[PDB]
């Protein structure tokens, strides 16, 4: 009778969860005046890319972005005069993630090659070549990060996620549990503990150290293709294909905020959140990307000038500008 | 600007430079996608086989009339894959592989090649059908000993159109048959897609040699159709 | 791995022609901007040319300016400097030295042995030579006529220690950060036009003079070198 109490406990939970919450963060932020309408201006477009882009990631140093794309190029790019300090050619022209290391001194890529390939752009010789190439997952990877500049996290197409010793080169931990793609991953301002969602409407919070699946989040009804936490730590925002985000509370365990609207009925590609986490910005399928209130789930603010589908967002570490690559080639620079 | 930042303004030129040539280079080539199913023989579609850029994805590399043409198969992956597909949407055209000598994975075949063809990604690209072992077709149809109505009713009540394309003469049972299944597959082609993508049905051996050359007139078609389709001509 | 080699040096004539090679093993040749560099025998360092990467902008000093060709050659990664009408003047070392230019490069990590060949901005140090005692901390400092600090927060002031018979190395770059492979020991500092370099704790390998760079090309001026003598 093991399905049977399966089903039971799956009941109970709802009872728990129901019991937890006797109200909406609706009401309770009612009492905050609304932030307005923004309107952010494009400073820089970072042009140079041949072909359609699907990911990129800021600096630690908040100047230095990369950024992957199907020409088979890692492009690193000095944001602020639109330089283009480092192009790294990749064996395989199919990469669907990219990781800047917190020190600076490595790049992680990857996708429909079953590696995740390392680069040390720090080098004597003064060219950047390949540090590692970390093997051993049996899908398409979909998002790696870099945890202390000496061990990363990644996920692949095989329902699954793993930590890595870049030294060694072997899985030193494997998280397991998901039915579907696992495609977005998130790690904790403290990296202790870190989220992933797959194709199963269901997103996963992890500890890094046990290596154990610490927590389950579900309510979408589709894929989930985005993830990210909150600044604090405490909650992450949940983006899906349904046209929906969604706000999690890790100690609540539940649902906080539903962020949709009849307008939209596309996908979301990607998520995140602002320095103080008040505006939640997300990439649609509509050309253009989304600001809302965290706290009030209304639309303030739509930004808009990219001519094709939006598939990679990032907000800078100091929070004074958000860069969004979409699939023409083009990275735009809004502040 | 300072001496330093001169230098460094030279240097993204110089990568610059590089890119553009990259991107011309890789312009010049054409590229191909290779979908299909187990036992379907979609490894020999091509008489020669290469194995570069030996991967959880094979690639290959042919040229004809001194066009290149890039392929790719993907075999590692599970049974989903409607969320890698949207990579391969700027592709030039799909190869798609159905074995036709069997009759028990014809409707898997039709399933998924009507999955394709309603992709939201692949909504714009055309599909090549290629239908692999038509001599074990022929020999399966002329033994008798596997009834086709047994699994297509609608067969027994399907009369051949006057359409006399088969020189060599072949058995009329063959010719009704093959007729047959190319006719579910256009079916299934035309019922959507409102002349933004079309299939061009090809039969082909395990023998058969002029392969690429198929390949090619449908890409040069291809390339046609997006050419009159950008002066707005369609 | 990391080696550069230089040839051509000897004895000559006034108003005759040498041509000095520069052989680089170990590193992309092709994307670094290389630098000739003189230092008479009993002066200092002294620029005389430098060469882009991609043999583009090409920089002479004033001195040997319309007569010092300088060349690069990337098939065969050599550098070569042609001088035509040498007079008494330019008798001195002559070294190799590397550079590559990026928002956190280090533009003077490495130099050659160099060779020897016989026939704006003013840096000055605050002294000449100074005697210092092992284990304690050491003080050095220079100006310039004009604040190196630029309108983008860069200072561009390089720091550079030679000991006796071996090639200048580099310690401290813009002031912002110590080259790899130097001790962390070593502390630049300072503001407009003075700025300062201290040693917390010296050794017996600290032995040398100390120069100074600001980093405007078509100055390029050195410092005048203030040694240490162990006491």
């Known amino acids: 009778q093991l399905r049977q109490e399966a089903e039971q406990l799956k009941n109970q939970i709802r009872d728990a969860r129901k019991a937890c919450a006797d109200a909406t963060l609706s009401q309770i932020t009612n009492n905050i005046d609304p932030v307005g309408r923004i309107q952010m201006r494009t400073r820089r477009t970072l042009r140079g890319h041949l072909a359609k882009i699907y990911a990129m990631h800021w600096g630690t140093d908040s100047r230095l972005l990369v950024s992957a794309s199907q020409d088979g190029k890692l492009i690193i790019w000095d944001s602020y005069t639109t330089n283009k300090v480092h192009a790294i050619p990749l064996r395989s022209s199919w990469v669907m993630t990219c990781a800047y290391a917190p020190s600076g001194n490595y790049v992680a890529c990857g996708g429909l090659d079953n590696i995740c390939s390392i680069y040390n752009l720090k080098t004597r010789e003064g060219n950047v070549r390949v540090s590692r190439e970390l093997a051993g997952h049996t899908g398409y990877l979909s998002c790696c990060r870099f945890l202390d500049d000496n061990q990363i996290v990644t996920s692949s197409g095989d329902t699954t996620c793993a930590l890595w010793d870049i030294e060694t080169g072997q899985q030193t931990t494997t998280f397991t549990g998901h039915t579907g793609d696992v495609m977005s991953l998130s790690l904790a301002p403290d990296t202790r503990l870190f989220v992933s969602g797959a194709c199963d409407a269901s997103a996963k919070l992890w500890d890094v150290r046990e290596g154990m699946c610490r927590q389950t989040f579900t309510g979408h009804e589709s894929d989930i293709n985005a993830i990210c936490f909150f600044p604090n730590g405490n909650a992450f925002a949940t983006g899906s294909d349904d046209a929906t985000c969604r706000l999690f509370d890790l100690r609540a365990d539940q649902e906080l905020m539903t962020y949709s609207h009849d307008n939209i009925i596309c996908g979301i590609t990607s998520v995140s959140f602002s320095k103080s986490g008040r505006l939640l910005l997300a990439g649609y399928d509509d050309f253009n990307c989304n600001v809302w209130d965290a706290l009030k789930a209304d639309r303030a603010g739509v930004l808009a000038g990219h001519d094709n589908r939006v598939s990679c967002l990032g907000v800078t570490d100091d929070g004074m500008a958000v860069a969004t690559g979409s699939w023409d080639s083009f990275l735009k620079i809004w502040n | 600007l300072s001496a330093e930042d001169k230098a460094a303004v030279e240097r993204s030129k110089m990568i610059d430079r590089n890119l553009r040539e990259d991107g011309e280079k890789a312009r010049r080539t054409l590229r191909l996608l290779l979908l299909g199913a187990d036992n379907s023989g979609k490894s020999t579609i091509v008489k020669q086989m290469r194995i570069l850029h030996t991967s959880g994805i094979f690639e290959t590399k042919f040229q004809v009339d001194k066009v290149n043409f890039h392929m790719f198969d993907v075999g590692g992956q599970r049974d989903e894959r409607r969320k890698w597909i949207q990579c391969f949407n700027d592709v030039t055209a799909i190869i798609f592989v159905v074995d036709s000598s069997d009759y028990n994975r014809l409707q898997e075949a039709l399933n998924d090649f009507k999955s394709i063809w309603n992709n939201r990604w692949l909504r714009t690209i055309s599909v090549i059908l290629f239908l692999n072992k038509q001599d074990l077709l022929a020999e399966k149809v002329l033994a008798g000993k596997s009834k086709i109505e047994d699994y297509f009713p609608e067969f027994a009540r399907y009369t051949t159109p006057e359409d006399a394309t088969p020189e060599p003469g072949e058995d009329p049972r063959v010719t009704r048959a093959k007729y047959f299944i190319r006719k579910e597959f256009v079916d299934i082609s035309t019922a959507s897609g409102d002349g933004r993508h079309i299939c061009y049905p090809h039969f082909t051996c395990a023998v058969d040699t002029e392969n690429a050359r198929r390949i090619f007139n449908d890409c040069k078609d291809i390339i046609l159709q997006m050419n009159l389709r950008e002066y707005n001509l369609v | 791995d990391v080696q550069l080699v230089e040839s051509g040096g000897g004895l000559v004539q006034p108003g005759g022609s040498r041509k000095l090679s520069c052989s680089a093993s170990?590193?992309?040749?092709?994307?670094?901007?290389m630098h000739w560099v003189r230092q008479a025998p009993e002066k200092g360092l002294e620029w005389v040319a430098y060469?882009?990467?991609?043999?583009?902008?090409?920089y002479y000093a004033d001195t040997v300016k319309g007569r010092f060709t300088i060349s690069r050659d990337d098939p065969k990664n050599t550098l070569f400097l042609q001088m035509t009408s040498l007079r008494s003047e330019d008798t001195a070392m002559y070294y190799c030295?590397?550079?590559?230019?990026?928002?956190?490069?280090?533009?003077?990590?490495?130099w050659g042995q160099g060779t020897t060949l016989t026939v704006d901005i003013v840096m000055t140090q605050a002294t000449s030579s100074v005697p210092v005692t092992p284990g304690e901390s050491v003080s050095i400092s220079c100006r310039s006529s004009?604040?190196?600090?630029?309108?983008?927060?860069?200072?561009?002031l390089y720091w550079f220690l030679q000991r006796p018979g071996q090639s200048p190395q580099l310690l401290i770059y813009?002031?912002?950060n110590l080259a790899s492979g130097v001790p962390d020991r070593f502390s630049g500092s300072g503001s407009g036009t003075a700025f300062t370099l201290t040693i917390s704790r010296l050794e017996a390998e600290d032995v040398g003079v100390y120069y100074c760079?600001?980093?405007?090309?078509?100055?390029?001026?050195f410092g005048a070198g203030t040694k240490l003598e162990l006491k």
């Open positions: 030295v590397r550079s590559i230019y990026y928002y956190g490069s280090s533009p003077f990590d490495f």
């Open positions: 170990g590193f992309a040749f092709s994307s670094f901007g």
């Open positions: 060469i882009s990467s991609g043999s583009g902008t090409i």
């Open positions: 004009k604040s190196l600090l630029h309108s983008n927060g860069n200072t561009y």
């Open positions: 813009r002031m912002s």
């Open positions: 760079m600001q980093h405007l090309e078509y100055p390029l001026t």
